[PDB]
């Protein structure tokens, strides 16, 4: 298996209404396991997957304290950034961060990243080498220097190449049943039409996990997917995902068209005929 | 498990 842990932090400023909103979420593959919402009740880091509840006081206390530190660094960044770009206190602004690490089928380090965005676009990001930084504007450049002189990349690398993979594995094990899972997509094929001159055929992939999947419409070699409508893979609500693709095919040629399903829960790529 | 050393920008 190729697994990962990702943390997503979004911070939105609220000119005139108080402290910015702060949401923090944690995953392992496509399963969220913790959350923190400055709006919620507890004001603590909360479990969001069953396999993480078993960790004790020590864990939540710490996890909670850290997330509060994260919000702090963010509460301020909004202020700091608003400055770099001399923006008015009148508008709302967003900051998002995300960092994590991937492990190979051996559960050893592979990749690690820490991306930072402000108002929707990259501000700064750590390079694959976890030693260098990348900046977008003259503004985001100031930040870079302030992190090259303070040795940020350093710390991240240690965490990213260590604690991250270390804990990921821990999670992967404690959640053997829930995460080592490979739910195969249950297939379907629907044909509808407005009235002659064409068919509306949709290939259907349902109840699959993880979300990694690729649907292709091909007529024995014809690259039809170039003119196929595919919807974003969407969540079912019970841990699995759904997705579909369709093409407007001239009544008649529809039987020559075949759909291709690609998912890690399938030995051989499925080919459905009409 | 969260990172323990956030840094301002």
């Amino acid at each position: 298996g190729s697994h990962s842990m990702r943390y997503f932090f979004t911070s939105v400023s609220r000119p005139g209404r108080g402290e910015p909103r702060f949401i923090a979420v944690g995953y392992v593959d496509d399963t969220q396991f913790v959350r923190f919402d400055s709006d919620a009740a507890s004001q603590r880091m909360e479990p969001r997957a069953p396999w993480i509840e078993q960790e004790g006081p020590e864990y939540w206390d710490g996890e909670t304290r850290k997330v509060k530190a994260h919000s702090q660094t963010h509460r301020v960044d909004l202020g700091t950034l608003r400055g770099y770009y001399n923006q008015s206190e009148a508008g709302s602004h967003t900051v998002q961060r995300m960092y994590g690490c991937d492990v190979g089928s051996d559960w050893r380090f592979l990749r690690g990243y820490h991306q930072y965005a402000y108002d929707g676009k990259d501000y700064i990001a750590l390079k694959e080498d976890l030693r260098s930084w990348t900046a977008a504007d003259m503004a985001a450049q100031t930040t870079k220097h302030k992190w090259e002189a303070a040795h940020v990349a350093e710390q991240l690398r240690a965490y990213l190449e260590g604690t991250c993979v270390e804990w990921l594995r821990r999670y992967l094990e404690n959640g053997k049943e829930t995460l080592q899972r490979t739910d195969a997509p249950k297939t379907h094929m629907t044909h509808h039409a407005v009235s002659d001159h064409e068919a509306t055929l949709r290939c259907w992939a349902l109840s699959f996990y993880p979300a990694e999947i690729t649907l292709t419409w091909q007529r024995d070699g014809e690259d039809q997917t170039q003119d196929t409508e595919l919807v974003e893979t969407r969540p079912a609500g019970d841990g699995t995902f759904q997705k579909w693709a369709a093409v407007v095919v001239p009544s008649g040629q529809e039987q020559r068209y075949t759909c291709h399903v690609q998912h890690e829960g399938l030995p051989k790529p499925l080919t459905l005929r009409w | 498990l969260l990172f323990g050393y956030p840094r301002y920008v």
Partner: T-cell receptor, first 110, second 114 residues
């Protein structure tokens, strides 16, 4: 007790090897340190380890084994000047508390 | 680094005294510890930022302020022989820049007699 340290006085002759052990409880710790305190003076930081593995500076050599939650410090080529008591510290985050072990004294014999 | 005065001090039960401590490293987190023979170091009070101060392991009998990010004075309002110990001050980067490392001040030896 969050951090347990070696033992009582550790006597070693000049030029020998002075090895110190450290063990912690909190699974989440991510930073480890080694301070040196000379009698009647303040603790002085001498070693920091943030990753699993071995690190070296001068005559010191620090090891970290997160799996066993154990920390080390080996003083190569000892000198009486190395005589002092060594404190082990460990922490989880920026806002977590620094936890030192009782420290282990080291009487370097000439 | 971290500086603190006085170096030595004698007082009699009842006298008030303030242990001064400062740091010029632009650190956000400063702490006060007391060192006893059978106890190693013990936290008294600490502060993660200016205008902020929360208690530690043995806060009893000590007061503490933090109006500025550079200073962190420990105040005793009415001495006591149990307060006889060595006091160390320590700053830490916290959320600012620098390698996460706590540095100790020089210390201050105090002795309170009846």
């Amino acid at each position: 007790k969050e951090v347990e340290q070696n033992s009582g006085p550790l006597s070693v002759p000049e030029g020998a090897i002075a090895s110190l052990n450290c063990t912690y409880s909190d699974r989440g710790s991510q930073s480890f340190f080694w301070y040196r305190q000379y009698s009647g003076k303040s603790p002085e930081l001498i070693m920091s380890i943030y990753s699993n593995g071995d690190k070296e500076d001068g005559r010191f050599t620090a090891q970290l084994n997160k799996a066993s939650q154990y920390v080390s410090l080996l003083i190569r080529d000892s000198q009486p000047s190395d005589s002092a008591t060594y404190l082990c510290a460990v922490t989880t985050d920026s806002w977590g508390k620094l936890q030192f072990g009782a420290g282990t004294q080291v009487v370097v014999t000439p | 680094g971290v500086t603190q005065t006085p170096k030595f001090q004698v007082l009699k039960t009842g006298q008030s005294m303030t242990l001064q401590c400062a740091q010029d490293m632009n650190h956000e987190y400063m702490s006060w510890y007391r060192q006893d023979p059978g106890m190693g170091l013990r936290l008294i009070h600490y502060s993660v930022g200016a205008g902020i101060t929360d208690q530690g392991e043995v806060p009893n009998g000590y007061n503490v302020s933090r109006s500025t990010t550079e200073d962190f004075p420990l105040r005793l309002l009415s001495a006591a022989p149990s307060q006889t110990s060595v006091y160390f001050c320590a700053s830490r980067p916290g959320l600012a820049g620098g390698r996460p490392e706590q540095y100790f001040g020089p210390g201050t030896r105090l002795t309170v007699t009846e």
